[PDB]
Design an enzyme around this catalytic site. Structure first.
Site, PDB file in Angstrom:
ATOM      1  N   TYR A  11       0.828  -1.193   0.000  1.00  0.00           N
ATOM      2  CA  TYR A  11       0.000   0.000   0.000  1.00  0.00           C
ATOM      3  C   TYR A  11       0.868   1.250   0.000  1.00  0.00           C
ATOM      4  CZ  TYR A  11      -3.716  -3.352   0.930  1.00  0.00           C
ATOM      5  OH  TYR A  11      -4.608  -4.392   0.812  1.00  0.00           O
ATOM      6  N   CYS A  33      -0.054   7.004 -10.917  1.00  0.00           N
ATOM      7  CA  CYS A  33      -0.357   5.992  -9.900  1.00  0.00           C
ATOM      8  C   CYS A  33      -1.834   5.609  -9.797  1.00  0.00           C
ATOM      9  CB  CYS A  33       0.135   6.456  -8.539  1.00  0.00           C
ATOM     10  SG  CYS A  33       0.036   5.166  -7.288  1.00  0.00           S
ATOM     11  N   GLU A  69       3.252   3.502 -11.417  1.00  0.00           N
ATOM     12  CA  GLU A  69       3.051   2.590 -10.324  1.00  0.00           C
ATOM     13  C   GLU A  69       1.575   2.216 -10.315  1.00  0.00           C
ATOM     14  OE1 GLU A  69       5.491   1.706  -7.775  1.00  0.00           O
ATOM     15  OE2 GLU A  69       4.843   2.732  -5.917  1.00  0.00           O
TER      16      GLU A  69
HETATM   17  C1  LIG Z   1       2.723  -0.754  -5.781  1.00  0.00           C
HETATM   18  C2  LIG Z   1       1.311  -1.023  -5.307  1.00  0.00           C
HETATM   19  C3  LIG Z   1       0.616   0.008  -4.662  1.00  0.00           C
HETATM   20  C4  LIG Z   1      -0.683  -0.207  -4.199  1.00  0.00           C
HETATM   21  N1  LIG Z   1      -1.335   0.813  -3.578  1.00  0.00           N
HETATM   22  C5  LIG Z   1      -2.606   0.604  -3.163  1.00  0.00           C
HETATM   23  C6  LIG Z   1      -3.351   1.690  -2.477  1.00  0.00           C
HETATM   24  O1  LIG Z   1      -2.783   2.814  -2.287  1.00  0.00           O
HETATM   25  N2  LIG Z   1      -4.612   1.411  -2.072  1.00  0.00           N
HETATM   26  C7  LIG Z   1      -5.198   0.196  -2.242  1.00  0.00           C
HETATM   27  O2  LIG Z   1      -6.359  -0.010  -1.817  1.00  0.00           O
HETATM   28  N3  LIG Z   1      -4.569  -0.837  -2.854  1.00  0.00           N
HETATM   29  C8  LIG Z   1      -3.307  -0.710  -3.327  1.00  0.00           C
HETATM   30  N4  LIG Z   1      -2.648  -1.774  -3.974  1.00  0.00           N
HETATM   31  C9  LIG Z   1      -3.270  -3.092  -4.133  1.00  0.00           C
HETATM   32  C10 LIG Z   1      -3.175  -3.852  -2.805  1.00  0.00           C
HETATM   33  O3  LIG Z   1      -1.839  -4.380  -2.622  1.00  0.00           O
HETATM   34  C11 LIG Z   1      -4.192  -4.991  -2.721  1.00  0.00           C
HETATM   35  O4  LIG Z   1      -3.908  -5.888  -3.805  1.00  0.00           O
HETATM   36  C12 LIG Z   1      -5.661  -4.542  -2.773  1.00  0.00           C
HETATM   37  O5  LIG Z   1      -5.929  -3.555  -1.777  1.00  0.00           O
HETATM   38  C13 LIG Z   1      -6.616  -5.712  -2.540  1.00  0.00           C
HETATM   39  O6  LIG Z   1      -6.005  -6.671  -1.672  1.00  0.00           O
HETATM   40  P1  LIG Z   1      -6.840  -7.769  -0.838  1.00  0.00           P
HETATM   41  O7  LIG Z   1      -5.832  -8.644  -0.117  1.00  0.00           O
HETATM   42  O8  LIG Z   1      -7.925  -7.070  -0.076  1.00  0.00           O
HETATM   43  O9  LIG Z   1      -7.552  -8.619  -1.990  1.00  0.00           O
HETATM   44  P2  LIG Z   1      -6.953 -10.060  -2.317  1.00  0.00           P
HETATM   45  O10 LIG Z   1      -7.193 -10.955  -1.128  1.00  0.00           O
HETATM   46  O11 LIG Z   1      -5.527  -9.875  -2.785  1.00  0.00           O
HETATM   47  O12 LIG Z   1      -7.893 -10.483  -3.547  1.00  0.00           O
HETATM   48  C14 LIG Z   1      -7.532 -10.134  -4.878  1.00  0.00           C
HETATM   49  C15 LIG Z   1      -7.652 -11.376  -5.746  1.00  0.00           C
HETATM   50  O13 LIG Z   1      -8.946 -11.409  -6.355  1.00  0.00           O
HETATM   51  C16 LIG Z   1      -8.882 -11.091  -7.740  1.00  0.00           C
HETATM   52  N5  LIG Z   1      -9.419  -9.732  -7.931  1.00  0.00           N
HETATM   53  C17 LIG Z   1      -8.827  -8.619  -7.466  1.00  0.00           C
HETATM   54  N6  LIG Z   1      -9.533  -7.513  -7.799  1.00  0.00           N
HETATM   55  C18 LIG Z   1     -10.619  -7.901  -8.501  1.00  0.00           C
HETATM   56  C19 LIG Z   1     -11.786  -7.217  -9.158  1.00  0.00           C
HETATM   57  N7  LIG Z   1     -11.933  -5.856  -9.130  1.00  0.00           N
HETATM   58  N8  LIG Z   1     -12.699  -8.010  -9.791  1.00  0.00           N
HETATM   59  C20 LIG Z   1     -12.558  -9.353  -9.833  1.00  0.00           C
HETATM   60  N9  LIG Z   1     -11.530 -10.026  -9.260  1.00  0.00           N
HETATM   61  C21 LIG Z   1     -10.536  -9.378  -8.585  1.00  0.00           C
HETATM   62  C22 LIG Z   1      -7.411 -11.066  -8.126  1.00  0.00           C
HETATM   63  O14 LIG Z   1      -7.144 -12.038  -9.143  1.00  0.00           O
HETATM   64  C23 LIG Z   1      -6.621 -11.334  -6.855  1.00  0.00           C
HETATM   65  O15 LIG Z   1      -5.949 -12.596  -6.900  1.00  0.00           O
HETATM   66  C24 LIG Z   1      -1.348  -1.553  -4.438  1.00  0.00           C
HETATM   67  C25 LIG Z   1      -0.666  -2.585  -5.067  1.00  0.00           C
HETATM   68  C26 LIG Z   1       0.634  -2.377  -5.520  1.00  0.00           C
HETATM   69  C27 LIG Z   1       1.322  -3.535  -6.209  1.00  0.00           C
END
Ligand SMILES: Cc1cc2nc3c(=O)[nH]c(=O)nc-3n(C[C@H](O)[C@H](O)[C@H](O)COP(=O)(O)OP(=O)(O)OC[C@H]3O[C@@H](n4cnc5c(N)ncnc54)[C@H](O)[C@@H]3O)c2cc1C
Ligand code: FES
Lengths: 297, 96
Positions: free
Chosen positions: A78, A255, A295
């Site tokens: 994040y 970003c 990013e």
């Molecule tokens: C450099 C970088 C910066 C980031 N900055 C931010 C930030 O500032 N704020 C922020 O909220 N997040 C940010 N993210 C993304 C964050 O790391 C998470 O991946 C995101 O918040 C969701 O994670 P989670 O564990 O809740 O979902 P997860 O448990 O990781 O579930 C996601 C999984 O479900 C599937 N999926 C994901 N999204 C969708 C969708 N819209 N529709 C259908 N299927 C989907 C994907 O295949 C993935 O495997 C960033 C990521 C990176 C790499």
């Protein structure tokens, strides 16, 4: 290679997934309205000054619980929302901006994101396992007279929060800004429009040094009657922008949500072939100049 | 260690072998090459040149700021090599 981005003092991978710093939840406020499609929270953590992060970095979050295999969940990253000094301006504090991942799939089944939901769910006093700091890609320019173009969609505003705080809210002896900070932020609703009153207060105390533009896809359209996407709002200045694109002290930062940049590239394509230029080759070049920085997730 | 240096003078190219403990212009001179100079203590502009490739250890100059070092500018009178390096000489006016 010496870089045009401040590389001095920047530390990386100080804590890793094997030995995370355990921090603590101080705040946790929803910052989207109730009608908002997605729900996004702004959260701050206690660090003990133990993570001297710098503007643009990002951190890792090990969500509580285990996967199917008794094994921890995987590090989610994040973008750091607070400036170096933190929100409290004492450098014992890190701030995140998190949208709660909730969708319905084609079977009607409400899916929730592990880390995203873990984080919005945090109460004052909860423990957080913390990795980082991470990323060198999004560090500020060295130039304190820089033109800094920031494209953001959703929780891709986070680093740029971090940026502006330092630039406009804070007084540093080693650092006083005096260029032009232009910000483009694209969202679904006027209810998804993050931190707006802050940027207000900035635009209010630095009128010529700060320029903001928002793009509410679901509440505005252009003269051409199409939904106002980031690119669409940008296209409204395709002039100065393309112009500013040939300066040596203009640095672009993008970003947010994977996909926004198709939108943007498409707009740049038509601006490039105006001068007889192929875009991607001009792109590359700016990148080599650290002048274009991306990013997305 | 000794490394190859290729000099692109305004009167053509010429190569030569330079030990990593000897300043570059020092070598050029015994090797009979006429490169511009003045101070020979690295706080002037006469020996100016531009790095095309390869690296140098010009710690102990004082005339250039970092953006000129960043720009591959070099003071020949106070540059040792740390690699095989290609260099344009007679570049003072260009810096000027
Ligand atoms: C450099 C970088 C910066 C980031 N900055 C931010 C930030 O500032 N704020 C922020 O909220 N997040 C940010 N993210 C993304 C964050 O790391 C998470 O991946 C995101 O918040 C969701 O994670 P989670 O564990 O809740 O979902 P997860 O448990 O990781 O579930 C996601 C999984 O479900 C599937 N999926 C994901 N999204 C969708 C969708 N819209 N529709 C259908 N299927 C989907 C994907 O295949 C993935 O495997 C960033 C990521 C990176 C790499
Ligand atoms: S001649 Fe003055 S520094 Fe080389």
């Amino acid at each position: 290679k010496c870089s045009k981005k401040q590389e001095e003092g920047v530390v990386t991978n100080l804590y890793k997934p094997k030995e995370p710093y355990v921090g603590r939840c101080l705040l946790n406020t929803k910052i989207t309205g109730d009608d908002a499609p997605g729900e996004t929270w702004h959260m701050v953590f206690s660090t003990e000054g133990k993570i001297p992060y710098r503007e643009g970095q990002s951190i890792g979050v090990i969500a509580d619980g285990v996967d199917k295999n008794g094994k921890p969940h995987k590090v989610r990253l994040y973008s750091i929302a607070s400036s170096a000094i933190g929100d409290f301006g004492d450098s014992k504090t890190v701030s995140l901006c998190v949208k709660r991942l909730i969708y319905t799939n084609d079977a009607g089944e409400i899916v929730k994101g592990v880390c995203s939901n873990f984080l919005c769910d945090l109460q004052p006093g909860d423990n957080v396992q913390i990795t980082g700091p991470v990323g060198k890609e999004m560090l500020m320019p060295k130039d304190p007279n820089a033109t800094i173009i920031m494209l953001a969609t959703g929780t891709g505003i986070a680093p740029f929060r971090s940026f502006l705080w330092k630039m406009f809210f804070e007084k540093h002896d080693d650092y006083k800004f005096n260029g032009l900070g232009w910000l483009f932020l694209g969202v679904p609703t006027s209810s998804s429009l993050l931190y707006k009153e802050e940027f207000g207060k900035m635009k209010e105390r630095a009128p010529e040094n700060f320029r903001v533009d928002y793009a509410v896809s679901r509440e505005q359209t252009n003269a051409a009657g199409e939904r106002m996407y980031i690119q669409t709002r940008m296209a409204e200045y395709k002039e100065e922008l393309w112009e500013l694109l040939k300066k040596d002290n203009t640095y672009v930062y993008m970003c947010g949500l994977k996909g926004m940049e198709k939108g943007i590239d498409d707009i740049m394509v038509s601006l490039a072939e105006k001068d007889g230029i192929d875009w991607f080759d001009y792109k590359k070049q700016l990148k080599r100049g650290d002048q274009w920085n991306v990013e997305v997730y | 260690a000794t490394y190859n240096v290729k000099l692109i003078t305004p009167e053509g190219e010429v190569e030569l072998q330079v030990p990593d403990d000897v300043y570059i212009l020092d070598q050029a001179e015994e090797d009979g090459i006429d490169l511009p100079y003045s101070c020979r203590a690295g706080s002037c502009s006469s020996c100016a040149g531009k790095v095309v490739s390869g690296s140098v250890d010009q710690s102990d100059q004082s005339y250039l700021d970092d953006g000129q070092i960043c720009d591959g500018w070099v003071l020949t009178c106070h540059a040792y090599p740390t690699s095989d390096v290609v260099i344009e000489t007679h570049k003072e006016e260009e810096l000027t």
